[PDB]
Design an enzyme around this catalytic site. Sequence first.
Site, mmCIF file in Angstrom:
data_model
loop_
_atom_site.group_PDB
_atom_site.id
_atom_site.type_symbol
_atom_site.label_atom_id
_atom_site.label_comp_id
_atom_site.label_asym_id
_atom_site.label_seq_id
_atom_site.Cartn_x
_atom_site.Cartn_y
_atom_site.Cartn_z
ATOM 1 C CG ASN A 1 48.551 35.018 13.238
ATOM 2 O OD1 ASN A 1 48.665 34.483 11.882
ATOM 3 N ND2 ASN A 1 49.328 34.562 14.215
ATOM 4 N NE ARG A 2 46.097 34.027 8.463
ATOM 5 C CZ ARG A 2 45.916 33.540 9.363
ATOM 6 N NH1 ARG A 2 46.517 33.398 10.628
ATOM 7 N NH2 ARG A 2 44.788 32.672 9.330
ATOM 8 N N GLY B 1 37.257 37.409 10.202
ATOM 9 C CA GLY B 1 36.244 37.197 9.064
ATOM 10 C C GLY B 1 37.024 36.987 7.800
ATOM 11 C CE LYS C 1 34.256 42.191 6.157
ATOM 12 N NZ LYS C 1 34.921 41.910 7.365
ATOM 13 C CE1 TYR D 1 34.980 39.470 3.659
ATOM 14 C CE2 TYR D 1 34.930 41.166 2.120
ATOM 15 C CZ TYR D 1 35.433 40.478 3.174
ATOM 16 O OH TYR D 1 36.561 41.148 3.939
#
Lengths: 239, 239, 239, 239
Positions: free
Chosen positions: D16-17, D82, D149, D145
């Site tokens: 969405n963004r 995420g 990742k 994070y």
Amino acid sequence: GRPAFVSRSVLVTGGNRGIGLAIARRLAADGHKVAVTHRGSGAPDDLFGVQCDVTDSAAVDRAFKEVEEHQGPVEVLVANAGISKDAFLMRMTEERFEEVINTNLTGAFRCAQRASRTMQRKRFGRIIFIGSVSGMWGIGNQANYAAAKAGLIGMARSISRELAKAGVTANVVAPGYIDTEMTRALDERIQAGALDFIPAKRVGTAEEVAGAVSFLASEDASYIAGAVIPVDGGMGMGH
Amino acid sequence: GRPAFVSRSVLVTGGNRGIGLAIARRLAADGHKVAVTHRGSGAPDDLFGVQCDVTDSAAVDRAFKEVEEHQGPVEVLVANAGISKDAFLMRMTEERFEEVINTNLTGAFRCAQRASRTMQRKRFGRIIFIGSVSGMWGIGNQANYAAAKAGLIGMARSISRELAKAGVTANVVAPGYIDTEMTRALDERIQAGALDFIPAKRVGTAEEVAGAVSFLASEDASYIAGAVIPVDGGMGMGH
Amino acid sequence: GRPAFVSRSVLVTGGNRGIGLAIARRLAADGHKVAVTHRGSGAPDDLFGVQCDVTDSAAVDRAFKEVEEHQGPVEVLVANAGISKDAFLMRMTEERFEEVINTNLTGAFRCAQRASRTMQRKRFGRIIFIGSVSGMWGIGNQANYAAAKAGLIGMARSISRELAKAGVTANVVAPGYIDTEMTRALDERIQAGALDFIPAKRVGTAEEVAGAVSFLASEDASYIAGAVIPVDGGMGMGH
Amino acid sequence: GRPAFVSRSVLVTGGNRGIGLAIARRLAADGHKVAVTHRGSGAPDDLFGVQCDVTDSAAVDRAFKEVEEHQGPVEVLVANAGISKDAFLMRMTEERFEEVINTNLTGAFRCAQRASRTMQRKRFGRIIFIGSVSGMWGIGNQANYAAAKAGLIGMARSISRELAKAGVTANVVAPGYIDTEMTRALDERIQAGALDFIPAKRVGTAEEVAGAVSFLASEDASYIAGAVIPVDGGMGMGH
């Protein structure tokens, strides 16, 4: 020459069998003060054992407190606890993935965080994650195990970038195939052809893994941070 | 516990100053039989020195023969010899590039090849290349030095894939900034801001590098092949 | 929607056959202006050829001058020249090692250095080294080829750290086993089991390598610097 | 000349963004059929949206069913959902760690697992995980994070080793600092000196990340498996 030995307060999670037991026994023979966590079966030799469910942050806290009351704050954490639950990707359930993630990766976080309280304050810490060749090499049928063991590298590097200035380092020991960890399935994998991927053409021993952990717990590793030390006979070589 | 110590025949190239001297002195205090090469200034302490121009394959052969007549065939080769000759890419001459390549990379090959004759036959060898954080991190103005030190990783992995089955392993120790190797230029780099790239927020000591070499020369490193062991305070972390 | 295409001045070294040919043909079909170096065999199709031995810095200078006069200064350099000359470590001569280094590693430097001044002035450059899975994976019997192709990584990263701020980047495309490069000996090795090293279970095509170079020459790679793009069917996965 | 374009069924999670939006818009402008998951904000432009929380395996199943009924089974999955939730190690809670793991790492698994059965049957799949420079570089205050990742890399490699022989590959695009993801705190960090960590000396754009995903979704990436494609201006270079 050789720097004077310092007896460190050591905690080895899952240190009652297999690789963890070899690590615990080696670090104790090195002269350290070695405690181990287990899930109930009991501690080995004369080592201080504490029961610990590494999926429970409250149990981790209470386990660390029991160690601290026995031998003082943990200076060297060896996060060895972790399970394997293999499956083909299309057959791997959410539960099979999350259980391996929770014990191997989040479990290691829970211990590293709980250890960091005193490590940062005392300006000394060795956080030693037991990873796997699979983290960067990708053994098939291990979407969950390879993700958890690669995640340890990212976590160790983020911890080291934050805290190495305070004398707290985080490194990963990444074993390949190791004799104490061989199951029926892994043994059949070797016979089928997995040895071709191992330059040394043999599995390693738990005592070989323990030798690298001994190094990283020693006075000879003060400038090593965020490293992956592979103990795999060359299996994991690549990029 | 700790395996029994074995006194190994060790050769440290460029082992008369800086990092190489710290390695030679540490391995000798470990109990090994340590020889060093130099370019004329002479060997340190009581260590057996041989003159060697590592750009000359004939000199390498004769240097190894002089070591073998003194202490027996080399079991642990520490290829530390190598020069730095920095320049901006557009200012780097063919001669500046090739001279660093010839001493640091081809020089290490000449020694590794000359050592492999007896290592393979005796089914034991530790080939330990001294690389640099620059090999995988890319310090600027080091097109030649970073190429040579990354080349050591490729060579160590090709050697290990061929010969680890015969007990001959090749690994790289990759130092970051190290106190004995600090020049005027490097010191000014630190003051300008290079410490921000080092999580440990300090340069390392030559004795810290020697501690990792001591490990890789020891009985605790038999299942490690093709590894890059960074001794850099976390500086080289990445991919 | 998508970025507007820009026709770049391209130089492909060793673009007469195999991977270099496929790269040259793809970049020309993309819309680029493609020059090719060769040692007598000529350039493919209608492409502009220059006779150039990348072991000769004077020939590299002359070749870039001819390309500049013909199509403008080089904006995208694809350093593809270089071959393997395999041998067991103990059987590899100084000459066999240095010949491979001089073409694959030093030759790529000669071209990157000669390209760099105008790339910096125009604040645009794509230096694309053609590496190999062997650089980080270590194919046995390739102490020379693995050293050269790993050396490209260090060189690309030092160049990128120096010049990326001026819009000049260096990256490596690292092919695995590719059809056009398959000799009888490599085919027998694959047939004997080396295909098990490749997750894709097939060799790649020269056009698949060309596809990666096309991307790195395109408007979609402006923020990529110091990367190794493996085109190897998964063969090189590791650390 | 160049490969004929094939319009693929694409799913972009969290599109969405920011980066996800740019990926979705680029893949749609490429000619693909692009579906986007969101948590209420809707899909961009005219793209097919599905409301899906990637922490919920039942919602992932339902989302894939809606996409299959609308545009056919997913051929290219871009797992972009995420977010980060930074904290110093000692200040990071179990909840803050697990929330980031569950969305970034386990969420990507849920989608890759659900996509895998039809990809295997059709002998074509592109699983594209959106990683981060932090996975291998270790940004401080990102134990969660960086672990998530980096975990994507291990998962992509195990999936590739299992399924690449069926034409199903998994790769990681690892962005550095990207404009659309720059918060006030990240901007102040860059202003305070973190821009020195980026050789390109600028943040990337979401469209530059989208360019790498476009390549991995294209006909030019068939032989790429288990790769980390860094889109970071050189920031992540290391080992």
